[PDB]
Each structure stands twice: as C-alpha cells, then as structure tokens.
Design a protein around this motif. Sequence first.
Motif, PDB file in Angstrom:
ATOM      1  N   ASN A 285     -54.666 -44.137   7.186  1.00 30.55           N
ATOM      2  CA  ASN A 285     -55.171 -43.610   8.449  1.00 30.55           C
ATOM      3  C   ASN A 285     -54.337 -44.097   9.624  1.00 30.55           C
ATOM      4  O   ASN A 285     -54.135 -43.360  10.595  1.00 30.55           O
ATOM      5  N   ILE A 286     -53.850 -45.336   9.564  1.00 33.47           N
ATOM      6  CA  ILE A 286     -52.962 -45.829  10.615  1.00 33.47           C
ATOM      7  C   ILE A 286     -51.685 -44.999  10.651  1.00 33.47           C
ATOM      8  O   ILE A 286     -51.221 -44.572  11.717  1.00 33.47           O
TER       9      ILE A 286
ATOM     10  N   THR B 283     -52.510 -41.534  12.109  1.00 31.23           N
ATOM     11  CA  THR B 283     -52.659 -41.517  13.559  1.00 31.23           C
ATOM     12  C   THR B 283     -51.313 -41.673  14.250  1.00 31.23           C
ATOM     13  O   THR B 283     -51.054 -41.022  15.269  1.00 31.23           O
ATOM     14  N   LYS B 284     -50.439 -42.527  13.715  1.00 33.51           N
ATOM     15  CA  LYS B 284     -49.110 -42.660  14.305  1.00 33.51           C
ATOM     16  C   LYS B 284     -48.351 -41.339  14.243  1.00 33.51           C
ATOM     17  O   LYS B 284     -47.737 -40.912  15.229  1.00 33.51           O
TER      18      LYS B 284
ATOM     19  N   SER C 198     -49.830 -38.852  16.737  1.00 34.24           N
ATOM     20  CA  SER C 198     -49.395 -39.154  18.095  1.00 34.24           C
ATOM     21  C   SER C 198     -47.953 -38.719  18.314  1.00 34.24           C
ATOM     22  O   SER C 198     -47.623 -38.141  19.356  1.00 34.24           O
TER      23      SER C 198
ATOM     24  N   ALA D  24     -55.404 -36.775  18.118  1.00 37.77           N
ATOM     25  CA  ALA D  24     -54.772 -37.533  17.038  1.00 37.77           C
ATOM     26  C   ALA D  24     -55.828 -38.202  16.155  1.00 37.77           C
ATOM     27  O   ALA D  24     -55.854 -39.417  15.968  1.00 37.77           O
TER      28      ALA D  24
END
Lengths: 61, 111
Positions: free
Chosen positions: B52-53, B56-57, B60, B75
């Motif tokens: 998930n990190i 999201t990166k 973005s 995002a």
Amino acid sequence: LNIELTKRMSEAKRVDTGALVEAGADLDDIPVYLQRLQELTEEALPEKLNRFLDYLNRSSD
Amino acid sequence: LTEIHQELETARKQQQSLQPVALSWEKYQKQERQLADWLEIERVKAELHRLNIELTKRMSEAKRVDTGALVEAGADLDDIPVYLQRLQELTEEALPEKLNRFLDYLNRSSD
C-alpha cells in the motif's frame, strides 16, 4: 497516518531541488526532512531574504 | 507542431507514470487474495502495508505528471480503478492518436 506521511514526503521531494534528494520517502528518512525543515526556518530563509532585500536596495536604487 | 509534440510527450509521461501503478496494483491484488485465502497473519499484513505504501507513492507520482482526467480521483486504493482505466484509455486511444497526429504534422513541416 503512515500513508499521509508518505504522501507528504512525496510533495516535499516534489518541490526540493537537492536539499533532500538523497533522502527517501520512508519513515526512516523522516528525521532528515525534519532537520532540513528547521534549517529552512532558522538560517536559510532569514539570511536569504536578507540577501534579497540587500540586493533590491543596493541595486534598483 | 511544437504544441502537438508537447501533447504527445505529456501523454507518454502520463502512461509511463501509470504503468508502475498497474504493476503494484496487481501485486496488491495477489497479496489480498492470499490474505483472504488465509482467513503468520501479521507478516501478510506487513506485506500489505508495504504494498500500500508503494501504491500510494506510485499514485502520487502519476498525479504529479497528470494534466486533467486524474484530477477527480485521489491517491487512495479506492481510486485504483480510474487510474487503471486511464492507462487503458491511453495505451489504446490517447497515445496512438497523438503519435499519429505528431507524425503527420512533422511531415507537414519539413516536406
């Protein structure tokens, strides 16, 4: 929170020009950004606005 | 011609940004199905955190290089579908047309 933090860090790297380029976007890189932040709030912005005003006065007049 | 070339370059950049989002979303889908089958749990949930990190990166990043359509969404995982749709809409309809137009006007200013 982590999501937000990561997102926030991204925007930082979005506007940085090399201050934290070597840094990442993980919580382990949070302190570096923090350090950079305090610098921008301690010496960079004050002295650099001083330079800008000094140039605008010595020149343009 | 330069205007057309800038349009094509923006489309290419948007597609390149979007593709890693698709890869990470597929990895996330695999991990989510693994976890659902599981229902040891903590390790899978930590892998979900990592995925998930990354998601999201990538979201973005794709937002940064966007010039429109992606502005509505955010995002977040729930916005994953629209981005995927956008990718398709590019790879099949946006990028080709643009390219053709460019390759047309390039010949129209030279020949």
